[model samples]
Target: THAPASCLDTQYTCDNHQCISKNWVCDTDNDCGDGSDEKNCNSTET
Candidate 1:
């Protein structure tokens, strides 16, 4: 069943059931609160 909100094309899904800007991902900041946004950041991208 659909519980949490769905992340859009320009959104990033957090492990804590949250959505944030895709650009915010790996930005060296805890935008997702759960630190999910900063996860899996191995390299820089466009």
Candidate 2:
């Protein structure tokens, strides 16, 4: 089977297992199970 679809259609930054669409909220659960949709998770403090 093909990978799950991302919440966002356009390209954007995300964690290795996170998804934060341009018009959506960010979370730990893989919104885009494919992983591409969240390959930039923030693990740092600000």
Candidate 3:
């Protein structure tokens, strides 16, 4: 199962998933494996 897309912080990580901080540099791989620590997702998806 995948981590919740709603989760957007390392502080809110799953046991087996990884949540990178918003300060992470742009990399090839997803800094946050679960893509939860990414910012701007909670902005009501304009």
How do the predictions measure up, each by TM-score?
Answer: 0.70, 0.28, 0.24
Ranking of predictions according to TM-score:
1, 2, 3
| Full ranking by lDDT | 1, 2, 3
The candidate that wins on lDDT is 1
Error of 3 at 45 (Å): 3.1
TM-score of 2: 0.28
Model 2 Cα lDDT, one tens digit per residue, 1-46: 9775654455344555344564432344455566544344565522
- Pick out the ten consecutive residues of candidate 3 with the lowest summed lDDT: 21-30
The model with the greatest TM-score is 1
Residue-wise C-alpha lDDT for candidate 1, range 1-46, written one tens digit per residue: 8556578867888888688898998998889898888875886753
Q: Candidate 3 regions off by >4 Å? A: 1-19, 25-30, 39-41
Worst 10 residues of 2 by lDDT: 37-46
Backbone clash pairs for candidate 3 read 8-36
lDDT of 3 by residue, 13-36 (tens): 433355555455233334555544
Model 1 TM-score relative to the real fold: 0.70
